[PDB]
């Protein structure tokens, strides 16, 4: 059995558009995603998600709603990534480029799947339908899924 590390992912989903951020530097630059990062000691997962959204995009929100959980396994990495996925309930400011992320709005008929993580093609449609989900994806490298499971759930 493997150990897991907690991460968050936040999607600012509005009726006609979604905010994504492009990772700018280091390895993995060039992919659009929601905003998030590692949960820290003592904070709830939801509070860590709010913190990462603020650090990465400049947006503050009072509340999130949990929509899914996705476990990622990478060949050659013994530690699993346990990603808790949230959507914002309202936003109150403008996104700001940081050094980790360049935020950009996308219309919901222009979701940039080819420039997102491959797994997003599977679970993000559920997110768009306002469904809740559990997923697992095993990757070889950054691009190749070797195994995955995805299930709609009534409770995350
Ligand atoms: N396959 C995948 N699909 C997806 O949709 N999001 C993924 C993903 N793999 C990783 N992520 C997300 C989870 C999280 O939001 C982010 C990874 O977090 P990071 O390691 O950048 O966190 P931190 O910035 O806290 O870490 P440090 O560099 O240690 O500060 O990418
Ligand atoms: Na962090
Ligand atoms: Na990061």
Q: What's the N-to-C CA distance of the chain in angstroms? A: 22
Separation of 30 CA from ligand 2 center, angstroms? 19
Tell me, using a 6 A CB cutoff, whether residue 72 lines ligand 1: yes
Q: Are the beta carbons of 5 and 38 closer than 8 angstroms?
A: yes
| Closest ligand 1 atom, residue 34 Cα | 15
For 101, other C-beta atoms within 10 Å of its C-beta total: 24
**String of DSSP letters for 27-94:** TTTT-EE-B--BPPTTS-HHHHHHHHHHHHH----S-EEEEEEEEEEETT--SEEEEEEEEES---S-
Q: What SS3 class is residue 136?
A: strand
Q: Hey, where are the domains in the chain?
A: 1-156
Q: Given the structure tokens 């709010």, which residue do they identify?
A: 50
Residues measured by CB to lie within 5 Å of ligand 2, the ion: 37-38
134: burial class by Cβ within 10 Å (0-12, 13-18, 19+)? middle
Retrieve residue 113's tokens. Answer: 């799947």
Separation of 109 CA from ligand 2 center, angstroms? 31
- The data reach a resolution, in angstroms, of 1.2
Region 1-156: CATH code: 3.90.79.10
Return the exposure string of 28-54: e unless at least 16 CB atoms fall within 10 Å of the residue's CB, then b.
Answer: eeebbbbbbbebeeeeebbebbbbbbe
| Closest ligand 1 atom, residue 72 Cα | 1
Separation of 81 CA from ligand 1 center, angstroms? 8
């Amino acid at each position: 059995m493997k150990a897991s590390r907690l991460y968050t992912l936040v999607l600012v989903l509005q009726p006609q558009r979604v905010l994504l951020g492009m990772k700018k530097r280091g390895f993995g630059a060039g992919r659009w995603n929601g905003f998030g990062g590692k949960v820290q000691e003592g904070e709830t997962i939801e509070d860590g998600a709010r913190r990462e959204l603020q650090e990465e995009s400049g947006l503050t929100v009072d509340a999130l709603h949990k929509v899914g959980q996705i476990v990622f396994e990478f060949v050659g990495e013994p530690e699993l990534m346990d990603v808790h996925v949230f959507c914002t309930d309202s936003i109150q400011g403008t996104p700001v480029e940081s050094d980790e992320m360049r935020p950009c709005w996308f219309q919901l008929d222009q979701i940039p799947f080819k420039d997102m993580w491959p797994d997003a093609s599977y679970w993000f449609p559920l997110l768009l339908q306002k469904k809740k989900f559990h997923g697992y994806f095993k990757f070889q490298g950054q691009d190749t899924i070797l195994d995955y499971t995805l299930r709609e759930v009534d409770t995350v």
